[PDB]
Amino acid sequence: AQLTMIAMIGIAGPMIIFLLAVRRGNL
Amino acid sequence: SYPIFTVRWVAVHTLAVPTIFFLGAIAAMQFIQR
Amino acid sequence: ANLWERFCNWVTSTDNRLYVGWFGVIMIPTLLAATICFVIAFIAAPPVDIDGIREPVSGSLLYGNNIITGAVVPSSNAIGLHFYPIWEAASLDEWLYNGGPYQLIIFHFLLGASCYMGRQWELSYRLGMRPWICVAYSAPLASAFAVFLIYPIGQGSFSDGMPLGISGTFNFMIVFQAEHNILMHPFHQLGVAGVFGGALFCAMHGSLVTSSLIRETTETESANYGYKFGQEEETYNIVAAHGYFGRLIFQYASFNNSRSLHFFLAAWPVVGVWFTALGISTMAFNLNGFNFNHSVIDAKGNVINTWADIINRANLGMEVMHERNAHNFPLDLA
Amino acid sequence: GGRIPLWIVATVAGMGVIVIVGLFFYGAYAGLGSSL
Amino acid sequence: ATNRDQESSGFAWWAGNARLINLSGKLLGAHVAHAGLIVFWAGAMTLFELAHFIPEKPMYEQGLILIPHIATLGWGVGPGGEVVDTFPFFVVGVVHLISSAVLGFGGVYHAIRGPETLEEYSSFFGYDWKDKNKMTTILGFHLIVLGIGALLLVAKAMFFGGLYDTWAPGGGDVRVITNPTLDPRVIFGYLLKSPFGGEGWIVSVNNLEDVVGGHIWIGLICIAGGIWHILTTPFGWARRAFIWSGEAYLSYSLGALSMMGFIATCFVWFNNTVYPSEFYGPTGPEASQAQAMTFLIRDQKLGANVGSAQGPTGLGKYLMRSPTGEIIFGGETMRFWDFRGPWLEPLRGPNGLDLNKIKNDIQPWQERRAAEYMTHAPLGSLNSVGGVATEINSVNFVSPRSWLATSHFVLAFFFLVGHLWHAGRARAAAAGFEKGIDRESEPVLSMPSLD
Amino acid sequence: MTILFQLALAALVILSFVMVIGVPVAYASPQDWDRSKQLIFLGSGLWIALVLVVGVLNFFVV
Amino acid sequence: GTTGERPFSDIITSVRYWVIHSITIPALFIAGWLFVSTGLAYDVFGTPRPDSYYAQEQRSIPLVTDRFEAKQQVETFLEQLK
Amino acid sequence: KLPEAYAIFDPLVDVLPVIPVLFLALAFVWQAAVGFR
Amino acid sequence: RGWFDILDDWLKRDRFVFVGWSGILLFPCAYLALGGWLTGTTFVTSWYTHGLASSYLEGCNFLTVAVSTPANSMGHSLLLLWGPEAQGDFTRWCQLGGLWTFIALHGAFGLIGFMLRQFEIARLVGVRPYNAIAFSAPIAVFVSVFLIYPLGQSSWFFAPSFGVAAIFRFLLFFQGFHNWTLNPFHMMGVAGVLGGALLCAIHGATVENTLFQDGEGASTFRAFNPTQAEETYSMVTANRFWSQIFGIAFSNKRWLHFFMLFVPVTGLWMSAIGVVGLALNLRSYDFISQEIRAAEDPEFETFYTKNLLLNEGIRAWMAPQDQPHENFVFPEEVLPRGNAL
Numbered sequence A: 001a002q003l004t005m006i007a008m009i010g011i012a013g014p015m016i017i018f019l020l021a022v023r024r025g026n027l
Numbered sequence B: 001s002y003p004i005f006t007v008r009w010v011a012v013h014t015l016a017v018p019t020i021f022f023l024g025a026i027a028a029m030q031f032i033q034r
Numbered sequence C: 001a002n003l004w005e006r007f008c009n010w011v012t013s014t015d016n017r018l019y020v021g022w023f024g025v026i027m028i029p030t031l032l033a034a035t036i037c038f039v040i041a042f043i044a045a046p047p048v049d050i051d052g053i054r055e056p057v058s059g060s061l062l063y064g065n066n067i068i069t070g071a072v073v074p075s076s077n078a079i080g081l082h083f084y085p086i087w088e089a090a091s092l093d094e095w096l097y098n099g100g101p102y103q104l105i106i107f108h109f110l111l112g113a114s115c116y117m118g119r120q121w122e123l124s125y126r127l128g129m130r131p132w133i134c135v136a137y138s139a140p141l142a143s144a145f146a147v148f149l150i151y152p153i154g155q156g157s158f159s160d161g162m163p164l165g166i167s168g169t170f171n172f173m174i175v176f177q178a179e180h181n182i183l184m185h186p187f188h189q190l191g192v193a194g195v196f197g198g199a200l201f202c203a204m205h206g207s208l209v210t211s212s213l214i215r216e217t218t219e220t221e222s223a224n225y226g227y228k229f230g231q232e233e234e235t236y237n238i239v240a241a242h243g244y245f246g247r248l249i250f251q252y253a254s255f256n257n258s259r260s261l262h263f264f265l266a267a268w269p270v271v272g273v274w275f276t277a278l279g280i281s282t283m284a285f286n287l288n289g290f291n292f293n294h295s296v297i298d299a300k301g302n303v304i305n306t307w308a309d310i311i312n313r314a315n316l317g318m319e320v321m322h323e324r325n326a327h328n329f330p331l332d333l334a
Numbered sequence D: 001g002g003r004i005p006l007w008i009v010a011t012v013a014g015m016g017v018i019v020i021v022g023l024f025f026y027g028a029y030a031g032l033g034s035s036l
Numbered sequence E: 001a002t003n004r005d006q007e008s009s010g011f012a013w014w015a016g017n018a019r020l021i022n023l024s025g026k027l028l029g030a031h032v033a034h035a036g037l038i039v040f041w042a043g044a045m046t047l048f049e050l051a052h053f054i055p056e057k058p059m060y061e062q063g064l065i066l067i068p069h070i071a072t073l074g075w076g077v078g079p080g081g082e083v084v085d086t087f088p089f090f091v092v093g094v095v096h097l098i099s100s101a102v103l104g105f106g107g108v109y110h111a112i113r114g115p116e117t118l119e120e121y122s123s124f125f126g127y128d129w130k131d132k133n134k135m136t137t138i139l140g141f142h143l144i145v146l147g148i149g150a151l152l153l154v155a156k157a158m159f160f161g162g163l164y165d166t167w168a169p170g171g172g173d174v175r176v177i178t179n180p181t182l183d184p185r186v187i188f189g190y191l192l193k194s195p196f197g198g199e200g201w202i203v204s205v206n207n208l209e210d211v212v213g214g215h216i217w218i219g220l221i222c223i224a225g226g227i228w229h230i231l232t233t234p235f236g237w238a239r240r241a242f243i244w245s246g247e248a249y250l251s252y253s254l255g256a257l258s259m260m261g262f263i264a265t266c267f268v269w270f271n272n273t274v275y276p277s278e279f280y281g282p283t284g285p286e287a288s289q290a291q292a293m294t295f296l297i298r299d300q301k302l303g304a305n306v307g308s309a310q311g312p313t314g315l316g317k318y319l320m321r322s323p324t325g326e327i328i329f330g331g332e333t334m335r336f337w338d339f340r341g342p343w344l345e346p347l348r349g350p351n352g353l354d355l356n357k358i359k360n361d362i363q364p365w366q367e368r369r370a371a372e373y374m375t376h377a378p379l380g381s382l383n384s385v386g387g388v389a390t391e392i393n394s395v396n397f398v399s400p401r402s403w404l405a406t407s408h409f410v411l412a413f414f415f416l417v418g419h420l421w422h423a424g425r426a427r428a429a430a431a432g433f434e435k436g437i438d439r440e441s442e443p444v445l446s447m448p449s450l451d
Numbered sequence F: 001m002t003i004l005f006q007l008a009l010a011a012l013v014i015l016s017f018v019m020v021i022g023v024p025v026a027y028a029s030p031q032d033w034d035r036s037k038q039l040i041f042l043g044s045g046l047w048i049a050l051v052l053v054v055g056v057l058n059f060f061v062v
Numbered sequence G: 001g002t003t004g005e006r007p008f009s010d011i012i013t014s015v016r017y018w019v020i021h022s023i024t025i026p027a028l029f030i031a032g033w034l035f036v037s038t039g040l041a042y043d044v045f046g047t048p049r050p051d052s053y054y055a056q057e058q059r060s061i062p063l064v065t066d067r068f069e070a071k072q073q074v075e076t077f078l079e080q081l082k
Numbered sequence H: 001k002l003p004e005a006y007a008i009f010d011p012l013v014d015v016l017p018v019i020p021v022l023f024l025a026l027a028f029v030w031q032a033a034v035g036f037r
Numbered sequence I: 001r002g003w004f005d006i007l008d009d010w011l012k013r014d015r016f017v018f019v020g021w022s023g024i025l026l027f028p029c030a031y032l033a034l035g036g037w038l039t040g041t042t043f044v045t046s047w048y049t050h051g052l053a054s055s056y057l058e059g060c061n062f063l064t065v066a067v068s069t070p071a072n073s074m075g076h077s078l079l080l081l082w083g084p085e086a087q088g089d090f091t092r093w094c095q096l097g098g099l100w101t102f103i104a105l106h107g108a109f110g111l112i113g114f115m116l117r118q119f120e121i122a123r124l125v126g127v128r129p130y131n132a133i134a135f136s137a138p139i140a141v142f143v144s145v146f147l148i149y150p151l152g153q154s155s156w157f158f159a160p161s162f163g164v165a166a167i168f169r170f171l172l173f174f175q176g177f178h179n180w181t182l183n184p185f186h187m188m189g190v191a192g193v194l195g196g197a198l199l200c201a202i203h204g205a206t207v208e209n210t211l212f213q214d215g216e217g218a219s220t221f222r223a224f225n226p227t228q229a230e231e232t233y234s235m236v237t238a239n240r241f242w243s244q245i246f247g248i249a250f251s252n253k254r255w256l257h258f259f260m261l262f263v264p265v266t267g268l269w270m271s272a273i274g275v276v277g278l279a280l281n282l283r284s285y286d287f288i289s290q291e292i293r294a295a296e297d298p299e300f301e302t303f304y305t306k307n308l309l310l311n312e313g314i315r316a317w318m319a320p321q322d323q324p325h326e327n328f329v330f331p332e333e334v335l336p337r338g339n340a341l
């Protein structure tokens, strides 16, 4: 359970970066 | 146009391949019980 | 100009052979006091009851020491962290017996060395330089603070400060290992990395510059005369030095930028020494090195020794023997 | 060539190294060498 | 992407946050986001501690540092520091966490989407670092806020539950403070006390009346000073004394915070009033004194005449005299004779430890407490093996006092390094040579030679 | 109301995850600034409402 | 200047590199894992298992004490384990 | 221990404390995405 | 062209990792030393030579793993895999400590190869050989500590074992048995190492704080070009600063950088000489005058005598487990101990 929760918390950040990169965001 | 296999390739792999092998071994050791 | 204006101009003058500055106004008297007291005490002070058990330790040359064994002995454990100036004693005889010179010396020295750091900043400002040489100096200064003030504060007594002597320093080190396992503490390991690497990089940089000196002299003359103080052009070929070192390891492991190189030279040892100073200053509050004593056990439960257990045997020898008459109860809690 | 971005490669590789080191510390507290 | 590259800002990525010096909107966003980080850690860590909390076991056996802070304020605990209700702990955690979410939203907004500079949108919130009047106005606002915080502590102590008093008659209890110390002689004599042994400067404050009175004075002084700095502008001597720039203000604050970190280190190491031993464990001096007391008790029970027991060195084995004559525990713990604690003070008379009281009036609770503290002295390894370095594995214990003292000494020192770095750089940048020496006007070349 | 309270809290957690991902993406995506603004406002309001609903119901379960 | 080898960044950001290594790296890692979990490492290197440091009632270490008989001494210790 | 109602979230609470460190790492991930310009 | 010249061409090709003739010696030996260390620390025990666990497979951690020295009964045997001890049995070789001599020998020859690499590359690119000359200090340290010292002692057993904690044990053994800290050659080594660190830090900081402004950036690194002819920092300003702060200062850059070479190298060489002495138990252990005085006068005490008591404790408490071949049994009553501890 803890491993799954931390995996989600930890993919979230790079996920934001990846979405803004795919979307030509104001990075 | 680049060659694939070079002296640099040999050096890199002589270090890299055993490193992954050993890391697998140590990971497995983490689950040994006395 | 008025008298005060003239005095300020003299104090801050960049034309004095030795800069004084406002930090210097504190540094000069305090360092002179510390130096004079240290020299006199090292030569002539009588034995000091360091551990407060009426067992004076002889530190001075005239009382049977040589250069290697001599020391200014820390103040008595009976004093603890109490402030013990000369005027707090009934007589100089009492002051000496209880080890007042140590307090006078270390306090004046710590204050003066802090002012020395500030003076480095101040003169850089007067000369129009960048300001961070004092930041480099903060590493050894922090180490001095750790061994002379912080560790005594944490342990409750100036008697546990580092003695002002060579063999005394060794005693401090051995007892520290017995009580804190400093060798197994990551901050001291970082300190060793800092100083080994500092020496390594010192040798590397010196050797690379010396190997890339440009020919300006003959074989009968020292190559050092090929450089003239204040000359505009560089005296060695950094491009050649980089070609050599990059081929020694590989291209991207070698600096081609002199500014980056010198920043790295500054940063490695300075950070290492900061961390080792923090190691002493944190073991002052009894957060000790790693303890793996009996960590490896077999199926039945037998202890399988490791090199850490061997270290522990050595530490036990030190612990049981140190300050052999001072402990009355089973645990050494400070 | 540059099909897979280098920042993604670096992030993923760092995550892998972190996971390996963390597992090793978990081992410090479990199994052999745990003192228990 | 205004000013978000080295070419346009002059700063490399590893110094990127310097790019914000003159972008007040993004800088406000940065500060609000970081404050969100602080509040978020408070909440998450408190919840972690509560989830791992075993109420029966002492707090200091469980690696707790925040729950003790809450308990010291009188929340959740009863006589002797026993935990009667953990819901206050849970509430503290949850509220700080939700607030952290709000702060994060605000910081992200001001840093990413809001106006990059506040000067055009508003002159009340916009500022110029060289505008001394506006700078002192913001300083005064925050002074008023801080004074309110101090008075909030006073209110908790006086009107909402009180504080946990380890010195309360009966063995430590939550007590409402009704007679705070308003005597300026006392309050500021604390500041005038020597920091050396047996004096301890402000670290020696040993009663909640003095604590509450001091915080009353702090709150009032802060409110008055904040009003002062809102209504005034710096005088000429100050204008000529200081460097007036953002980096200079940052450096001043770094120096102040470093000082406060060192002071906090000493506070948590030595003081057992605002850090009750019931929650933080014994101090080092306390544990050493406790060992002395424990073995005095054992040997006396066996029949020893402890007052007359001569040790190997000639000093009393159990009791001796301090350099000013007070009767004190013997052995190495002679250095800790300034220690004071509720389990020990009943044995002390005008001349120090009293032989008749030691012989006749030591109570079982005192014996138990001495054993407990002796066996939970603040000594342990980095991997949390309790005891001296030579001890074997078995006890999983490092004292909260050790954790807190070490952490905050590290922080205080590195913040001193920060003060030096940013103060030196502020001076050099104000004078105009922080980027190096001008080749065509090298100052030293125009100076006379030293010799 | 045990499972009801657990469901409300789980919804709070999931909505927090969605907001934590979405708010920065929307803010740094200037193109998507018509629908995303309404989405963010509605999500903030619902998050506050859920926080209150939890807290109120905390005293009706345990 | 470069010596003509393909750039590392170019290699590690390429699809073919990862097509190859998404197979090779896991295979080697699993090979090491199995080397340990099947017990072959103990046999290869002569390392005692947790239950093979001592005989059941033994507490003395099996130290080698003769240079030219050391191999046979170790074999005798191993037999005494049985 | 947490109040009984909240026991199901215990694994999440167990991991919450490290998120600030995750933020520090996120700064480097972002700078990598922008090439440390 | 002849085959020798063709081979020289290929060996000296410009490639990512230079090979050279020295490479034929360096690369196999360095690889074997490093690989042997990793292999031993991962999988190999010290049970039959020391009575110790020393590998990850047994449960040690990075601080406690080691490739431990062979048993004392092996003497100074080379312990070749095909030698009369292991007799070609790889498992028995590992159990007998052949990995220690394997690592030590392949590492020594690797150091030879690396120094030859320094010479070869310097000659090819046309620089002076001072990096190779400075490398003599690490080689002297390695030879003195890992070969000469054990060769003077009873066997390889007392050489340092290749590990973190094992090296720490080596330090404490030298203190307890040799009083190594009292040795003026170690003292000169300490001066060399700490002074080298001091020079490194002070020179780096001085350069970085006497830079010329050669660009508009607040990050000053981009304002240097490797091909530029001008000095990047002001020697005149640095000299003035240190003259006024410390009294003396460098005025010749060539002397400055040679001194940076000289200090650490000389210090390490001095330490090596001291260790050669210790190989024969030729210690700076005592001061005879102090011992005579202390023997006759029970009130005379110095930090020297205190440290001797510490050494006696170390010896008595660590010998039985650190030297298992001696079969020491020290009854509890004979162990030196102070009061109450």
Ligand code: CLA
Pocket (backbone or CB within 6 Å): E013, E014, E015, E016, E017, E018, E250, E254, E414, E415, E416, E417, E418, E419, E421, E422, E425
């Ligand atoms: C209130 C505190 C504070 C504030 C607001 C600032 C603000 C600033 N500083 Mg100062 N600084 C501070 C404290 C502070 N500093 C302290 C305490 C030190 C001493 C160490 C310094 C030393 C310092 C230097 C040397 C420099 C600055 C610079 C700067 C600027 C850019 C910073 C940046 O982009 O960092 C970017 C951040 C990073 C690159 C990350 C660094 C991460 C650190 C080193 C490690 C942290 C480890 C962590 C705590 C634990 C990790 C766990 C792990 C081991 C598992 C900015 C104006 C720069 C400047 O002059 O600009 C004008 C500059 O060169 N600062």
Ligand code: CLA
Pocket (backbone or CB within 6 Å): A016, A017, A020, A026, A027, E002, E003, E004, E005, E012, E013, E014, E015, E016, E017, E018, E019, E020, E023, E026, E027, E029, E030, E031, E033, E034, E101, E102, E103, E104, E105, E106, E108, E111, E112, F019, F020, F023, F024, F028, H024, H027, H028, H030, H031
């Ligand atoms: C507490 C830490 C901290 C904070 C608050 C900031 C804040 C800031 N930095 Mg700094 N920085 C930091 C650490 C920090 N930094 C470190 C450690 C480094 C070294 C790697 C840097 C290096 C650096 C550089 C080099 C630059 C900045 C810049 C900036 C500013 C603009 C950022 C931007 O354009 O984002 C763009 C990024 C994105 C759009 C990606 C998404 C970012 C969002 C905020 C993630 C938030 C996630 C969060 C979970 C959302 C919760 C929402 C929920 C509450 C609803 C901003 C005020 C820039 C600046 O000053 O510009 C003028 C700039 O150029 N920073």
Ligand code: CLA
Pocket (backbone or CB within 6 Å): E028, E032, E099, E102, E103, E105, E106, E107, E109, E110, E114, E115, E118, E121, E122, E125
């Ligand atoms: C010290 C922190 C701080 C500061 C100085 C500012 C300042 C500003 N913000 Mg920002 N903001 C903050 C925090 C902060 N904000 C936070 C945390 C959030 C998230 C909720 C926001 C969300 C936000 C938005 C969405 C907008 C602003 C806007 C503005 C501007 C107009 C504000 C105004 O007119 O106030 C009006 C005053 C009030 C509404 C009353 C506030 C009083 C509060 C509610 C209670 C009392 C204060 C008390 C001390 C709070 C204690 C909290 C403590 C626990 C930390 C101004 C430049 C606006 C802007 O940039 O316009 C272009 C805008 O659109 N802010």
Ligand code: CLA
Pocket (backbone or CB within 6 Å): E136, E139, E143, E191, E221, E222, E224, E225, E226, E228, E229, E232, E233, E234, E235, E238
């Ligand atoms: C966050 C707190 C804070 C800060 C940063 C400032 C900052 C400032 N104040 Mg304000 N002030 C504050 C709180 C604060 N104040 C409060 C709470 C009050 C109400 C009592 C005042 C009342 C006040 C007045 C009445 C005046 C200022 C003035 C000033 C300016 C000059 C300060 C100065 O020279 O200090 C440096 C201090 C000195 C040069 C004198 C004392 C220096 C001694 C020798 C140092 C002693 C250190 C000590 C021995 C070492 C140990 C410390 C230990 C005792 C804690 C400056 C802008 C002056 C100004 O221009 O305002 C218009 C002014 O006249 N302040």
Ligand code: CLA
Pocket (backbone or CB within 6 Å): I024, I025, I028, I029, I032, I078, I079, I080, I081, I082, I098, I101, I102, I103, I105, I106, I109
């Ligand atoms: C330059 C590379 C190099 C060098 C210098 C060494 C050096 C060494 N190795 Mg290492 N080794 C290497 C590469 C190298 N090795 C490689 C690549 C491997 C992996 C295959 C090994 C595997 C290895 C193992 C497994 C062991 C060593 C050992 C040794 C040591 C003993 C060697 C010995 O006695 O050889 C003697 C051999 C010669 C001197 C060669 C002489 C060649 C002449 C021309 C022969 C002339 C007569 C001959 C009969 C020719 C007949 C011709 C005709 C009749 C057909 C020594 C320190 C041993 C060790 O460390 O012990 C602790 C050990 O057990 N090595």
Ligand SMILES: CC1=C(/C=C/C(C)=C/C=C/C(C)=C/C=C/C=C(C)/C=C/C=C(C)/C=C/C2=C(C)CCCC2(C)C)C(C)(C)CCC1
Pocket (backbone or CB within 6 Å): E030, E033, E034, E036, E037, E040, E094, E097, E098, E100, E101, E102, E103, E104, E105, E107, E108, E111, F009, F012, F013, F016, F020, F054, H006, H009, H012, H013, H023, H024, H026, H027, H030
């Ligand atoms: C700007 C920037 C930055 C920064 C950022 C930040 C710092 C942010 C922050 C943020 C934040 C600070 C956030 C927060 C969040 C929060 C949240 C989201 C919360 C939530 C909560 C909840 C949901 C809860 C729940 C619960 C309860 C209520 C009870 C108990 C249980 C539980 C826990 C479940 C960086 C560095 C990246 C870089 C770039 C720029």
Ligand SMILES: CC1=C(/C=C/C(C)=C/C=C/C(C)=C/C=C/C=C(C)/C=C/C=C(C)/C=C/C2=C(C)CCCC2(C)C)C(C)(C)CCC1
Pocket (backbone or CB within 6 Å): E186, E187, E188, E190, E191, E202, E205, E210, E211, E213, E214, E215, E217, E218, E241
């Ligand atoms: C709460 C409390 C209390 C109280 C407290 C108080 C009351 C406090 C106060 C405090 C204070 C009241 C403080 C002050 C401080 C100050 C300072 C810290 C200052 C500093 C200064 C400076 C830094 C300066 C500088 C300079 C110089 C010197 C020269 C010229 C230049 C300049 C300006 C730069 C008590 C203890 C009772 C109890 C407990 C609680």
Ligand SMILES: CC1=C(/C=C/C(C)=C/C=C/C(C)=C/C=C/C=C(C)/C=C/C=C(C)/C=C/C2=C(C)CCCC2(C)C)C(C)(C)CCC1
Pocket (backbone or CB within 6 Å): A009, A010, A011, A012, A013, A014, D007, D010, D011, D012, D013, D014, D015, F013, F016, F017, F020, H012, H016, H019, H022, H023, H025, H026, H028, H029, H032
């Ligand atoms: C309270 C709460 C919450 C919140 C959360 C959050 C707020 C999160 C955040 C998150 C985050 C904030 C994340 C982050 C992450 C990060 C990471 C994962 C990083 C990593 C990094 C790395 C790995 C790096 C690497 C590298 C690079 C990039 C470049 C250079 C090189 C190197 C390798 C260093 C939730 C919703 C759960 C709900 C419940 C409650």
Ligand SMILES: CC1=C(/C=C/C(C)=C/C=C/C(C)=C/C=C/C=C(C)/C=C/C=C(C)/C=C/C2=C(C)CCCC2(C)C)C(C)(C)CCC1
Pocket (backbone or CB within 6 Å): B014, B015, B018, B019, B020, B022, B023, D017, D021, I031, I032, I034, I035, I036, I037, I038, I039
């Ligand atoms: C001895 C011998 C031999 C050889 C062998 C070899 C050659 C081996 C090698 C091996 C190897 C080659 C191995 C390797 C391994 C590796 C490892 C095991 C690694 C680890 C790593 C780590 C753990 C790291 C970590 C980290 C950190 C912590 C932070 C930063 C990042 C990093 C990632 C770095 C032969 C066959 C001749 C036979 C005879 C004997």
Ligand SMILES: CCCCCCCCCCCCO[C@@H]1O[C@H](CO)[C@@H](O[C@H]2O[C@H](CO)[C@@H](O)[C@H](O)[C@H]2O)[C@H](O)[C@H]1O
Pocket (backbone or CB within 6 Å): C002, C004, C005, C006, C008, E236, E237, E238, E240, E241
């Ligand atoms: C123990 C407490 C000590 C600190 C107390 C707080 C004092 C704060 C107010 C004192 C103000 C001092 O005021 C300050 O005096 C000095 C010295 O005359 C003036 O100094 C000025 O004149 C002198 C001549 O005497 C010149 O050398 C100097 O270059 C010039 O700046 C400053 O311009 C003024 O700002």
Ligand SMILES: CCCCCCCCCCCCCCCCCC(=O)O
Pocket (backbone or CB within 6 Å): I081, I082, I083, I084, I087, I088, I089
């Ligand atoms: C100078 C170059 C040295 C190279 C040496 C390579 C060593 C390779 C040895 C591998 C075979 C070992 C022989 C094993 C059988 C020997 C048994 C025996 O008869 O004693």
Ligand code: OEX
Pocket (backbone or CB within 6 Å): C051, C077, C155, C159, C160, C175, C179, C322, C323, C326, C332, C333, C334, E332
């Ligand atoms: O004085 Mn010097 O050393 Ca610190 O621990 Mn306790 O007190 Mn004593 O015993 Mn171990």
Ligand SMILES: [Cl-]
Pocket (backbone or CB within 6 Å): C171, C175, C321, C322, C323, C324, I306, I307
């Ligand atoms: Cl001693």
Ligand SMILES: [Cl-]
Pocket (backbone or CB within 6 Å): C326, C327, C328, C329, E330, E331, E332, E333
């Ligand atoms: Cl004692």
Ligand SMILES: [Fe+2]
Pocket (backbone or CB within 6 Å): C205, C209, I203, I207, I257
């Ligand atoms: Fe140089």
